[PDB]
Symmetry: T
Subunit: 151 residues, 12 copies
Amino acid sequence: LADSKAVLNQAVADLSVAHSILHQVHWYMRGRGFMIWHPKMDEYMEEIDGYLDEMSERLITLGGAPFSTLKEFSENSQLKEVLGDYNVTIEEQLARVVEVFRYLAALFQKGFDVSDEEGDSVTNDIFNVAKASIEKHIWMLQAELGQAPKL
Amino acid sequence: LADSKAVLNQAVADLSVAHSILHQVHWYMRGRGFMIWHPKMDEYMEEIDGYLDEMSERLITLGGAPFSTLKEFSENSQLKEVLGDYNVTIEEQLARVVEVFRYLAALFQKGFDVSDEEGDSVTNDIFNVAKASIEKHIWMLQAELGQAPKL
Amino acid sequence: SLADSKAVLNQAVADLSVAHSILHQVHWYMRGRGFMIWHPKMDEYMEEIDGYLDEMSERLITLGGAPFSTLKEFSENSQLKEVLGDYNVTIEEQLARVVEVFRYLAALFQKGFDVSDEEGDSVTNDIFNVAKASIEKHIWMLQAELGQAPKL
Amino acid sequence: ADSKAVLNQAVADLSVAHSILHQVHWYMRGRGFMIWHPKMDEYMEEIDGYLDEMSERLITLGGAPFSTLKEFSENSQLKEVLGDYNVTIEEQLARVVEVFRYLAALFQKGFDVSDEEGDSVTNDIFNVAKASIEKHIWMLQAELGQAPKL
Amino acid sequence: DSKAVLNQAVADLSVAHSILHQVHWYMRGRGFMIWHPKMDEYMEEIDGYLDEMSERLITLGGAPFSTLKEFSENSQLKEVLGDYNVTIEEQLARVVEVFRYLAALFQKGFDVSDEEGDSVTNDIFNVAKASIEKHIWMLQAELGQAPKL
Amino acid sequence: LADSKAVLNQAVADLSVAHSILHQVHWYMRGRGFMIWHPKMDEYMEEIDGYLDEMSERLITLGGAPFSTLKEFSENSQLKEVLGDYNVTIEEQLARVVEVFRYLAALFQKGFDVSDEEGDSVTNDIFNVAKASIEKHIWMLQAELGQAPKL
Amino acid sequence: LADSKAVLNQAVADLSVAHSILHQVHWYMRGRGFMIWHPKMDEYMEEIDGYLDEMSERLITLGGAPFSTLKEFSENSQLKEVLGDYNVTIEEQLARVVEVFRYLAALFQKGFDVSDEEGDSVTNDIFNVAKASIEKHIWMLQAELGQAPKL
Amino acid sequence: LADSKAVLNQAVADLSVAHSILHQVHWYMRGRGFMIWHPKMDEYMEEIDGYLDEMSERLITLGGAPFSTLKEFSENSQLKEVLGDYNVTIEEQLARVVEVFRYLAALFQKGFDVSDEEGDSVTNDIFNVAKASIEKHIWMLQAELGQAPKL
Amino acid sequence: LADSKAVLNQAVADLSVAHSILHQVHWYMRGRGFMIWHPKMDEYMEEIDGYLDEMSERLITLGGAPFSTLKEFSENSQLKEVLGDYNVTIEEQLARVVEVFRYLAALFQKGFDVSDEEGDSVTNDIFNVAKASIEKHIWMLQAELGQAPKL
Amino acid sequence: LADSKAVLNQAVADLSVAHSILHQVHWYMRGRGFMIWHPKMDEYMEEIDGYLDEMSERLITLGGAPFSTLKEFSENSQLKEVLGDYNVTIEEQLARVVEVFRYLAALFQKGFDVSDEEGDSVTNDIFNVAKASIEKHIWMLQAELGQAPKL
Amino acid sequence: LADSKAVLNQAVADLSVAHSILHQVHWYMRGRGFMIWHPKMDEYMEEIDGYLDEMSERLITLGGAPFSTLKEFSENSQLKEVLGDYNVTIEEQLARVVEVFRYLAALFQKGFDVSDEEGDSVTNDIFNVAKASIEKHIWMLQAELGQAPKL
Amino acid sequence: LADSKAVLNQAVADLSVAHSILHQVHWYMRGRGFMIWHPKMDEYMEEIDGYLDEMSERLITLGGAPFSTLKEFSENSQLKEVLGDYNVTIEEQLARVVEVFRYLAALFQKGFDVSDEEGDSVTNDIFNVAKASIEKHIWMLQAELGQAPKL
Ligand SMILES: [Ca+2]
Ligand SMILES: [Ca+2]
Ligand SMILES: [Ca+2]
Ligand SMILES: [Ca+2]
Ligand SMILES: [Ca+2]
Ligand SMILES: [Cl-]
Ligand SMILES: [Cl-]
Ligand SMILES: [Cl-]
Ligand SMILES: [Cl-]
Ligand SMILES: [Cl-]
Ligand SMILES: [Cu+2]
Ligand SMILES: [Cu+2]
Ligand SMILES: [Cu+2]
Ligand SMILES: [Cu+2]
Ligand SMILES: [Cu+2]
Ligand SMILES: [Cu+2]
Ligand SMILES: [Cu+2]
Ligand SMILES: [Cu+2]
Ligand SMILES: [Cu+2]
Ligand SMILES: [Cu+2]
Ligand SMILES: [Cu+2]
Ligand SMILES: [Cu+2]
């Protein structure tokens, strides 16, 4: 199950970086809609953390060794972080969360694919559930942004 | 008691159509304010459904036969429905909810008058409670829309 | 594109809206021994039906679709037929209507599952699978009440 | 005076109604016991609510509520019979319906008198209780295969 | 007879509820705001015993008193007309009197069911007697007195 | 006091002052029964604030403009305030609360009549509910004080 | 205290078999009343399981070794099991539960007497509590079946 | 305001007026973001009332006599009230709330300083806790206004 | 669906025996770690009971006849039971739970495969969910025992 | 009921000292298992305090005068106390709790017997309930220690 | 942190005695007001016990050894205990509670001062929080008794 | 680090790294005690994250710009991360948590010190509350490890 293990660990790194990006958005946010979207980032972060732990502990359950240092997370994630900036607009912050979420949905589709191909149905379901929820968020964030989900 | 029964049945039809219209607004909404107004439609729908069930079971209690098919709801409602359209602005969507709620408040006043006249105080009270909260919603929606309630 | 996955989701929106109306009718027009139990049971079924409806509609939206959202659309697209409310229907005839509504929904959900499986829409596939599971369980229980096997 | 009187009438009738419901609850036998036995508890609790609220309204209005079994029995227009296990479920439910029809008519009377005297507070207490009792009458009659026939 | 004492209790608990309700309603004087809702706790507890003991009697094949006529004729408690001029201390003194009668009745219930080998019924009277006696201590304590069981 | 708007706004002022009086009682109370009456004042104050907000927002809903400054509250209220005094007995504090509540119930009656006369049943219902509870409190308070409610 | 130990272990076997029988009734039930009685079986099963664990752990506490395999349960129980059959009427199902419960109350009576005579008052109480509730159930079950409890 | 007692009483007056100002904003608010900011005012008001009560009770506890009439509040407070106005923008509404909060945070700093100087550590902590939370609100409000907290 | 039905019924038998074994472990456990592992056994039992009822009622739902007697469970189960023994160490006790869980996870895989081939996706999901949770427990139990999960 | 009274009072003093010993164990505990047993001592302590207050209040109810000073507790208790010592192992700490419990269970038996002889049935059930729970704890502590309960 | 450690331990002793005195007041109380003040002694005892555990565990944390036997409590406490006496009036009982509380607040001031001088700010805040609450209780008790707090 | 803002950011970095190490301990833990200590890591991580968020917020509130990327956390933190290793004993894992907490306690003392010196009492409080709880955890972890807290 080497490829299911590799994608789980990929998600551990990516989700760790995604959490950090969401926390940055939470902190640096400024503009009309702050009061709604600032605590909304805690909800997204909590949900991201749930996926992270579950996917890491599935990796552990399968005999793997999850990345578990900030260096491992940062080096292995395909997500890129920039310095915090208070002058990013609300719309831009929401569009970055959408970018991250589209990335995660694509990653989860890959985890779904590989786990299916390896016959790892438990892992497959974990990815599917995460994908479901993330794609729903993309619809909502896009809607706020006056756009179709464009999945 | 023939008219109290009639107006309660009218309310069953109109509430069923108002539910559907609220559901459309909930689903087709796009633009800034989505994250607050999308779940708000669920609260409004649940409140509408509560009136619908209480007025219908009052009608039953009084010996009446509630409308209970979509054809009945559609044909007897004075509310008109259009196809859902994502390009309707948030402010236009809220304007639509306000016009539905104005209609309902007026319908509930007719219900109050009719049942008051017949001495059906229980029905009278159903209408008064429903009118009270709908009018408060009208104030709030109009305030969001930068307007006086204009009841 | 997921053309048929989207189509079956919207089919479900239509049928669930009509299913909801039928369960409400049963709820209101019910008379006979067993009323005190089956009348609020209809509220539980309605709420579950409403849950699938909202979730299937919002999956369709998520996918770039446009859900049916008027009574006219629900009526004309649903395969479920409605009749006028009638208080002289027996309890066991009411429960039998509910069973036939549920058999239809279970079959629709099966169609949703197969169609989404084939197009590789696994999220949609799981929504249908969960809904089918529950509907089929209620069929067992309703049928038991009616002194019958589930006969899926 | 009349609002006060009808409040006290309800105190007595609701006390006897509670007794009858408790009897139905205890002596019930037959298919449907397991649903209807605890149902009598919900009805009793609701009846006790009206009883205390109407009695306390009477106190608030300067009255003196009936507060002995003797007063309840001889002021109430509801008749009690000895407990009897032979009564069918449908008959037990029919007896509850009959008691509820009485309470609903009495609450209408309370509504009328209080409306005439301008005691809108008492007026609402009667309306709220009546609404709920009539709803029960529908459900009870439905179980019995019947229209509410208010 | 366990069955007889259970039915006596049904009658007396019915009358005791009426008396507590009377105290709840007619109470006036300093302490009303604490003692008025306290009567609700007592009545709820009294009604708990009433139902428990009645349905034990049904369980044993008995026929509980289920009419005010039966309650009033069989009960050994007496009722008087409600009176707003009764003092807070008098009202509470009346509550103690009722509770003392109840505990003694539950004592009799305990003895009789014990002699009869009916341990379930026995246990019902024991739990009830325990709480009533605790209440007697507290009421008496408020009244400046020892419980004097 | 020609109309419902007027009496609602009167309530707004009187309830504000009633709130302030109850707080005074709560703070300056001394003597046997403090442990029970002190927190009871909190209950009364929260109930009062409840009416205050309901009535103000009914007035807003009707298109009026609620008093919303202390000057407005204090000048338009017909209740009189005095300096906090620790040497007022418990019985005196309770008597003063009774006085406030008697005033409030009377005002709510005037509110009921004015709304009844102009067919504003929503407002009418608001006054009726508030009057019911206030009158119940007078009974209980009077009972503590060894008195009939004497409405 | 060998008798109390012996009866606690009997009850362990019998409660285990009683649970199985209730679970069969739960599964195989068909007919009007199913919707009430099917979940009612869960309540009974939970209560039986509470007795089982309590009685078992009292036996452990006393220095005994409770029956703890299906073979021990099945061979030591005096209750007899039959193949699940869907065609049994609801009435027959409830009659069967009554038979089981009568057996248990009688067993609990034996437990009460045996424990009383050894002066094991804790075991005594355990049987008394269990017996009280089972006899209450016999009444209700017999009431549904149109009969007196006939204890 | 030379001592802990004096600043605590100054706090009582200012908090009373702050409360009235927040209620005005709550009532008179119109514009996009109403549905979020209107109930937010209730949260602020409840927090404010919590400080009002604790500081007043602390004063009582220290042997002082709290201001407890509208006249005392309005005269002693350094906050100015103006007539309610429905044509104030949300941005303007939130800017006023910010002005009030900066005033309270400054007053709480004074109470902190004075109490530390007196060695009244209990009073000191009350001012510190209240200041902490108010400064946090300033950050959030400012961020909604697209600005740094600028304490 | 003959094979799905067969494997569901196998699960009913095996889960019934597994519950019995877990209960033995719960009862007979001695050694350091009791206070933790004794209630943990209750958790595992509740979970095992949940699969048992759900798999049995999926079988009923599919037109099957679940095993529903202790004799059917003992004879159909591939799990073997032995007399309770206080002298088994905690390590031995947890190792035994691990063996049981590995057995169940493998039966659930069989269940998953057979339902997959037959196109019974509802049953397939029931096995997959049960398998996931059991594998997770095997990881934790194994971790307690100082080992990799070694699925 | 002189001896019933006496033994209740013995229990007040002994439960007082037992509470103190358990608090010492709670505080001075060191070693593997701390994280479980440290909070467990709080559960035991709360349970011990429950019996203490219950038995004291029963004594008061019977016309007695509970020991209510530490002098009285110390002099009357048969339990002995020593200075806290962090160097005691976890296993000896738990053996010490067991000895306290064996004592209390013996005392509760004495209370049972005495109250039984005087026909104080209420006091009798109080000791029985308490004895049942303590003996259960003895089984559990003993199991942790790898021992039979040896009552 | 010698002085901080010493004063924490003095609190352990005095708080242990305070709890005993309150329990005495709880049990022996008689007179009008019993029904309010009897349960109020529970609230006080719970709060006292919370300080006792916190201060003891702060001392353990700091490397000290808490008093943990009744002899240590009784010999180290400055609080004096007398035999329970039902003839003490309610107002005398409350007066005794006031005196204990006055003693505890002064002890907590000493605690504050000593920890502040030593730079043990964690211990410092512990004393401050406890002091705040005790002084509030003093105001309330004094109020009941018709007096100023007179801190 | 030379002001409160500087130490707040240092805390953001260190808490981020502390969270990562705790998550590693949580994941890679094997040994007797796993079932207790694995979820206890979750409690420590929630708490650490509470500090991270409020310290970051406080920095934002003060006009600062928190580290908000993994690169920034990793490079600014003085904690070192090593690759996850299943072979580390439970006791070694616990000792690692203790080392981390000792570091955080020292950091928080530095934060307390710096903020006190600047007169930033709000920040000071934040650090003091955090230090308190971490030191208590150090006591408990050390107790598990059979050691004095050795602060
Ligand atoms: Ca648009
Ligand atoms: Ca059949
Ligand atoms: Ca090992
Ligand atoms: Ca050691
Ligand atoms: Ca005295
Ligand atoms: Cl799209
Ligand atoms: Cl828009
Ligand atoms: Cl009719
Ligand atoms: Cl049948
Ligand atoms: Cl071992
Ligand atoms: Cu985890
Ligand atoms: Cu309904
Ligand atoms: Cu939705
Ligand atoms: Cu009442
Ligand atoms: Cu009952
Ligand atoms: Cu408001
Ligand atoms: Cu157990
Ligand atoms: Cu206060
Ligand atoms: Cu089941
Ligand atoms: Cu106590
Ligand atoms: Cu502790
Ligand atoms: Cu945050």
